[model samples]
Target: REHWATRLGLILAMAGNAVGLGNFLRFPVQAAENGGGAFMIPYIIAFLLVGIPLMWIEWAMGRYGGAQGHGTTPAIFYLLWRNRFAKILGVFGLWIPLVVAIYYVYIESWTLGFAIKFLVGLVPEPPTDPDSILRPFKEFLYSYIGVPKGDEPILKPSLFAYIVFLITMFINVSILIRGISKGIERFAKIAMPTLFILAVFLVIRVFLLETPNGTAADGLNFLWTPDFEKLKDPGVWIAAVGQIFFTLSLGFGAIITYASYVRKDQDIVLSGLTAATLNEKAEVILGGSISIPAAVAFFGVANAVAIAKAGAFNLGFITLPAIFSQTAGGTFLGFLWFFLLFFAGLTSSIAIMQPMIAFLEDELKLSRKHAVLWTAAIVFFSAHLVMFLNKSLDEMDFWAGTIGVVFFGLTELIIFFWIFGADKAWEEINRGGIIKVPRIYYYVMRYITPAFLAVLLVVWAREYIPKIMEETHWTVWITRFYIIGLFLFLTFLVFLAERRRN
Candidate 1:
């Protein structure tokens, strides 16, 4: 079986891939940054409308493609139909994951650095009075993410963040060198469970805090209270989709590649639902529950909101360390949190690189040795931009995470439903199925998913185009050229890979 060693391993691996820093890091900040709990309205709605449906659609496509021994997106897309644009459209699937990794590794390095800080006892004890640290705290948070108007030291600037950048890449490469079961699956089996354990511990510790100003209950209410009035703003909805995309690892080829390794008789439908359920638990119950409430319990929502605004990195590294500082078991708690982040981020990072390496091997017919080397080289060179262009990191995240992912997902769904034939997709989804997909989702995937995605594209374009045109800097231009070069480069690679029957 050119499949996972075990079903349990595959499920855990998928869970590990989904339950990354997005669960612990991105989702919480997105909630706070948007409109607290009111954002959850469209968020939950979109999850049902898009997230779950996309998960199954991609899983089915990937599994079916794998059965034909076509693992990567170009193969998967082109196999669906021989249309000229099918290959080109599938090309973006490869680009989005690799492009996402460009910035993700840059941010992920801090998790690496701060894990070291835990070992060294550098993370401060929870602040005695977060109130006293007000101005300096905000300045400290802003300075690092290049938010400007702050005089504090840069928390994770080019020199340090870049150093860890190289380190993170090398670690991923070393693991990739080991291949799937021994490397990724084994790592996920251990890391995913450990992450959940640490989160529960941290959640327990967070709720036990005896702070006077604001309780966890306050944070809970603030986060869960439905502020539907905010839904009228399109940015909030874009944010909702962005959060879903980032957290679920959607629109990227990572999940598809993971599904490719699934057993011929394995049921992707149940697996997809199970993985999604596990991710939501870690994300909403553990990740979402712990951070804001704990931050509110000790520091108050004022600083938590500020930290969220400062950027999710600041909240996790700066504000979180400070929050832990005030606790009784500060050092141990910090260690637990950072280590969890390292595992979560590492798993997702490894998953992202899979399709890249798979493309090289499957399409370009490179040896594993050669494939790992080439992909690492590609990501490393592209990622160095993080060292020089801080705004470029934001731009990359916006375009790739926000814009690129949605476009790829919409394209793939259309290809799957319209071109591949929705009837065929539904039948393939039923193959080896442990649970039947509700027939209603046939309409959902066929019509509703596309409609919601269309709205997101239009609303996102209204925001993306004007900002992109307004930017005249060389950094942005370089970013644009790099993106274009990637597509052109991929076209050549995929041209060779357009066929190779396994």
Candidate 2:
């Protein structure tokens, strides 16, 4: 019963999901922080080797699922879970999105709050004292955002915020529940183009605005000018590879869910390449162009450049708002900026929620609406907890944003390449219609991509392990507990998927 409303819609929806919060906010910040221009070398390299091939694999598998009218967990396990090994991995394909959705909605709420403030001209002025502004923002999140406490700074969900978040999510789910063509395809067709146009307009506006005095050319040089020396740093390569993966939505089941809606004849290999390549270009040219220049114009190039180098997660939320508050036409521009972000976040949220919806429908015999409502309910309730209860939501954001995603990415690749057998995977990929991919792509998927991914995994662990230990002064057991907690979470999902299969 499920089918793409239009090929263009499917493309857009997948693109919409792929080009979410990270493409706009995270990518530019990370690139600027890491190697500036030098970052692109490894980014592009990984994009070709790991990003594109993995995209193809996801699409190919999704198409295979659709042809057989199956969801991701069932489709993947049925195809390659020999004796349940691969089937267990299929559960990670489910868990990543579900867990991510819990925290993601909380961030989504921030966008919602800002969009409201932007529209009402209630954009909070940057306090005369920076700490004044930051303290409230921090307290509001920890004490009130999602918490149920009566005296909380901003108790969870006033009628207004709740209505807005719910309605937005409802519309999103309705679109997706309408099946691929009518809902996903149609929405993407409009939204993706609109996003591109808006992005281009903003980028041009920011660049044409007068460059403030004392702005660092290093910001530009760092982003566009390459340093070959930085290329040798393992950290640089690790960050590049991670950026490529995150930008493409590689570790998330978003690709798999979207691909499952593609008809068997859809040329998945070409489609994958197109999506990955264009998405990256959009992030680099449009996203980077808009955010970096805007930051420079508002903050002075030097301050903006310093913020970029510092790699603070709050750059957009804290610094950018202050910058906008000082600008001419700041209110209108702020509205537009946050609105664009809200829409981007909304579209991506829909994409993230889809995989779990599909799994519930396929395996539990739930109707689309039932599955959607159930999953959304869980995410809705759990999300507010971050806003209200967690004093360290900012820190939690980094952990979830970076480590959580990396863990999911590693698990996904291990299952797809090692467990699934890359050769048979190619056969599934080629089953769909449209364009023929070069044979070299198959080689990349089978060997090249996985090898690179393995290296990244090691590098990520090396950097992450010591950092956690140093920062928390955590005992070895506490560190081990943290690592093992994630491992077990993933293992449990695999267990569930295999159990269902049997």
Candidate 3:
């Protein structure tokens, strides 16, 4: 089995993998919209009951599967249960990330493009002279959003984003081709630290800003000030739980794949705790402190609230650019800000890719080199569905990344703990654990986590599926076919894998 080159590398890789754009972009938006401090209440409870347990469970699952010389989720699940349905259930772990990464990489690469554009005076800000003090910034955002370029994309300034996308994809697959040590581990060391430091520094600058709309303190207050009445509503709890899953990248196979690289004696308990601590810092302190605060300080709570509702892409691309237009060091800050996102996106993009790559390696009997190539080949074809179909990307995210993850997670929770036997599963975790789990968590993982996650999935599906259908666009139907295609593709892959194993 593959192994992490160093302890620090494993921790950094896990931490960086978890701390994606969601930590920076998604978390703040969820918090700002859901009742600010009141949101943190369910968030904290969910983290304790759900995030931490799943973190440990995924790491344990990865290490367990790795010890048996398997890497893919199908293989991992089979190793645990030796049942047909177990392997089938595990297909989501393989399919979702591969699907999500297709479009996620495209969106992520924009950060790299925007960063470069800002540095070279293309994205016009305080330092750069704008035409009519608005045209440059307006044109800057329009150029990438493809508003000015129209339907025939991959052109002109948007060409830069696509070029960056190609480079990003190449870089991810290249790093992955080198195997875990050189590609994932080495880059994680560099990227994670840089992400944390830049975020921390940016947080300070944001905290000090006293804008005409609101002061930094007012912004921070907007994030942290508790509104207890919101807790009475079930939607707050739903949003909180969803944000937790989104923030941690749980129920996704990325963590399990990352964990599969650990040595037999490696300290996963310590590793999980450390990685989570790092992510929490990024999510709450940096993610929480910086974005919404900056937005509210400059644009006011009402406008920032509107911005949060818009989308992560809009918040990062449109709103932040508006913030940098008048702020000090706006030009340099823009470059650094997006680069931070680029790093975060890069780590996550690679991670989500790995589960599919591992599936190729374990199931197809391909070497790491060939596995990376094949996975990249598939992702290239699959991602175009998002680029070609309107609203299709959101559909893919809703199913593959969001809903699929929760389902896979709940399945794993059931299979790993009860089906595998709670006693044995706890022992499985303790094997390489340097830090011991408290007894109560074993019960929580077995009981509360799954219980809560089940409710979350039921409500989310019931509400969201109907809500999405209410729009009644052809793109949504196309996305349904796309999702069906994923299941069919995975079903075939699983058949081949099972046949080979037999």
Candidate 4:
């Protein structure tokens, strides 16, 4: 079987996936919330110590497996841990991508809606009241898209949104299932470059907007102004680490699965470092500069502060729209911002769906087309249910984004660093002579990445445990059930597979 086709295609696909919605929307809020410019200190540190090394580990594993013609679970377990115990980790690897794919499709649907609105020139002016904008948007999402119960209003679900989501998702999966060279490589070649060019153009335009009397300059200054005091808070460090994990697309099997398709001749080390470095630079330079300065210029620093106080997620959907309205070419800029966002989201969605498609094809020996179609249908239908159920959106987003991601992340680090042995993995990374990573990096991958992830996971669980403990409603039970059930199911799969082989 052919491994990865062209080096350029692989790089672009990896970059496209890494440069996602989180880069534009989540990164800024995370930084602002954590400590603005000061967040950069820990963020950069973690990016190097934890993010880069772990990325290399994942890439090395995938490329080595590909050269040997093995699937994700079989490849890792067969190579690293001869012990049957290690096989269970593969199931978690699979589970992470599958679970993430479900809700990721839902979020991608929102991008589709905005993309359609932009194309049709349906971009609304900023409303006098933020609720006027949010309420209608929420209703449309819930009534049509499919927000689950208890996630209503703020997290309303929508059937209509789901339909739109399915269409876009089908387009993405169809391309991938066609085969790597034809589908993924060709698409990434065009799509990834286009995304970068568009981002650069938008950044230039945002910078050109002159303030009445150097106010915009002041806003620009504020964008880089670091608050050293906030770093003293442990929460800030946690937020920085979380953002690093999210932005680099670590802990998710998406990267691992993508790497599996890579060729042995490819430089796994360079690819891993390139993906991590580019992703961080984009989020910090492009995402940070565009969002914070734009918000400051349009809303003024004072109004932006008020919105930040309200809610972080709302900052993008509500506050940014309002800020864009005040810009000189607000309408055009709004279109550009949201459209770029949609594009970023589309690429990431494609990456998310690949693992599901891979699993269907490998596990069941299905044709690529059959696998893609079935996976898309299931994801689309199940996600649509989110719109109909009240309060489903928030619940799903939280469960998938936070709990599901953390659990999977922990599993991956354990398998790669501890069970697999980072030293052995590092040796594999040095193969093909693409790039030479330092030997010490292995130690960082083995210890630092897991340490940081564990801290963040604990903090996440601690924050949410109280809410779950106090809840007695059916929705809460359902949410809890889904969370625990998924973990157990993953564990079961690993155990079964290992036993069968033994």
Candidate 5:
């Protein structure tokens, strides 16, 4: 029903969706955890086989589905395979992003709050104690997010923290209400450039650091230098493939929604690759350069690797702030880092929201205003639970964000590449491409991509599902039930939409 205002706008919006908090925060952790530079070997291979091929598949699917007057994934999948069950399977397109957005928006709020605190000169110098270098920042982070020091599993968020969340929500809602071209594209144009500029400035600062323990060079060496012994471990390969999957936003269904906005005759071949390339540039170059280097320069390579192992949030929220506080122009630098994250996160959160909004408007026949309102209402309330519950976010992230996305991607691959026939799929990809797609990708997409993704899904489930089931926290069950319930509700809505169409 609608198209991007400009080619540049469409590319920027697509790139913005792909370039996210995961690019900066999660990419480094995966790299460090998976054997540093050695990780890039399998990572690049996965990108070629899994990432780029699936990315092109998604773009082609969206354009094809949109031309048939469908925008949401369930409807899109139905158009592809012409089965009732396919659309039900397609509900994952709505479910995964919707679930991820619930927790994502809350986490995005933390960046906003930290940015404001840095702007207001509230962040203090790091404690001189070597034993408790992160103590002050940790306290601030725990207090801001309401992590209880006691045995209580739930905690109350600070009043200011709650207000900050609402304010952040307001920012996302305000932009979303303007519709795609005016809302998402316009913001992407400004935000993407601003994000890169801030990153470049921080990179320069990181390069200039002269820490007593290590140099920025050490960080770069550790990042780019491969440990061949670690590459022999299957875990390294799994980590690389997982990072590549998340890096390009391949499985989110948001990309499909975004691509659906491109006109039928537009050049998805070049456009899709452009978006993926931009995301890789951001992830490998800018994302890699900033936090890990700063960590090594201040805390040494071993400490930086240990910090990376602690978790993605630890690197972003705790480690970076402590480093910024000790650096020259620390206050402004801290603000820029967090605010860069704010923009990165804001771009991603809005994109995630789109899959559900697109579903509501396209399937449920709701007006744009009604769709936005319903989506926001559901998210605002759900985010409140996610904010307070200790294990809720992690549990939801593991199931919905991590494992679920991989499942969704694999299912779509089978339906499109195998079931729909590779010849037709290849023609669709090159249908209106400005640059012709190589004939080689046709065979690769048909033969290799599905097998690659299938193996990924099998490995993930076999390895992690047992460990996940062992978790018996009350909050975890609540989150899991909420996810299952939401999936069922969305499934019912799909059924209703189908009946109305019939």
Candidate 6:
């Protein structure tokens, strides 16, 4: 029941919640891969239709749930629909964030490890040979994360990597144990500003650099110039919608939990709008400006585009670091880049942890300390599995991160607009608004958004389900079984919580 210490702190924490590694790492690359400026068309469209409405819905739901003495979605869902199945649906509220955080925190640790490596001069100097310019950075990354060389089956993380993982885990746990106002809000206020400043500095650095290949302006043009024909491909549109969900942290249940901590009369409409805008500012202005431009400058436009399509990790960890290595003051800049990612990831990972903590406290009757310890122990062991198993991280991410959120978003819209009644939900969203949300969103949430989500889910499942089923590796099966088991285990806990309440 602890509230945020200040309104700015609350807004900043919400912004931090949405702004993850995806903003800096995943976003620009996704845009580049999906046709750059053309991608932004559907991206902005999906943001208006799906992203903003969901933000308002989640915020309104959380505030309502909090007012009713509930913070977790399982309990909140039960309160909304007054049915066992609805409450069961809330188990996703418990599962997705917990599941995503397992591997997410591990990845976050990589950022920290890289930052420290750059700061300590452990990162190697750039090779003078053109053929192997990126070789050292690639090798360092592969070694640091323990990606196997050649066809090796069993991969092991370096001890330094594992140790840093433990350190990062400790940081998340220590902050959560301090409670909200002191821990999350305090950290967000500091980290968000630091994240922004680092991003701005990096953008400036990218602009000022004189490159071996293309101008920074070429990078900007590549990202901003529209190829309208790309829109004809349905995949580009789908990717845009998916990125909107990913970037906004929609359907994650973290936003709902955070909203639950607000005062009854808080202005969620303005606050939610502001948070979504802040996430956009980071993704568009800062994130777009930094990596792609820097990559294009160092590697030339064609090579930068190829590197971007290669993958986000290739760009964030390998390509960018290689660029940093060849530059004057490269080490310090490399440190700042990874350090910015570390801060971004840390803010997000903490927010991801809070939903389960609230459920443990509010439903299971555990104290905050007990809840923090329990969640930490579970995620720590789960992370070790993710770290060692080669396929597990991606398998878990494909399900929990992509497919599951869309399903949850569709489910949420149904319950909020259909069952709970759109009229009531709309009124709830505007209860304490600084500005009235337009009436059109009323019809959009009620009709257009749900319809769009349904089509999206149907199309995605039709396409990806076949490919997902084709995977028969032990690691993949084991990962799927683990996720299924986790869901079942959370269901049992929710049953117990409800039974105890009765």
Alpha-carbon lDDT, every model = 0.80, 0.66, 0.82, 0.68, 0.86, 0.89
**Which candidate ranks first by TM-score, i.e. highest?**
6
Q: Is 2 or 5 the stronger prediction by lDDT?
A: 5
Who wins the lDDT comparison? 6
Can you give the lDDT of residue 136 in candidate 1?
48
What is the Cα-based lDDT of residue 402 in candidate 6? 82
Q: Over the stretch 1-502, how does candidate 6's per-residue lDDT look in tens digits?
A: 7888899999999999999898998898988888678888888898999999999999998999999878888988877788999988999988999999999999999999999999998986776564387888888988988888775545689999999999999999988999989999999889999989898989998887666587788888888887889878889888888888888988889999999998889899999999999999999889999898888887787788888998779999988888887888888999999999999999999999999999999999899999999999999988877888887888888788887888888888788878988889889889988888999999999999989989988898888878876866788888888889999999999989988988
* Per-candidate TM-score against the hidden true structure: 0.93, 0.84, 0.94, 0.88, 0.98, 0.98
* C-alpha RMSD for every candidate: 2.9, 4.6, 2.7, 3.4, 1.3, 1.1
Residue-by-residue lDDT tens digits, candidate 3, 1-502: 7799999999999987889888878888888878688899888888899889999999999998887777778888888898888888888888878877887887787778888888886765443332344455556666674542444423233566667777888988888988899889999989888988899888888888885678778878877887889988898888887777877878888899888888767889989989888888889988899788878887778878887887766667767776776876787887888889889999999999999888888778889998898888888777667655667777888787778888888999899998988999898887767889999998899888999989888888787776765776776787778778888898899899788878
Return the TM-score for candidate 6, rounded to 2 decimals: 0.98
Residue 270 of model 5: what lDDT? 93
- Candidates in descending TM-score order: 6, 5, 3, 1, 4, 2
Q: Tell me the spans in candidate 6 whose CA falls farther than 4 Å from its real position.
A: 128-131
The candidate, 5 or 6, that scores higher on lDDT is 6
Output the worst ten-in-a-row residue range by lDDT, candidate 1: 147-156
Provide the global lDDT of candidate 4 against the true structure.
0.68
lDDT comparing candidate 1 with the true structure: 0.80
Cα deviation of 457, candidate 6, in Å? 0.7
Mind giving the per-residue lDDT tens digits that candidate 4 earns over 1-502?
4466778788888888889889988887776665466778888777887678767877877776666655565436556667555555566566665666666666666766766765566655445454664465444333444434563333343455656776777777777777767887788788777778878887777676565433445555765776778767887777776677777877677787788888777788888788788887789888887766666665566655555555654566555655556566665666677777877887787787776677555544568888788777766665643544444445666666656666666666677667667566666778874769987776777777678778777887888888867864465466556646766765664455445545
Itemize residue pairs with steric clashes in candidate 6: none
Error of 1 at 93 (Å): 1.2
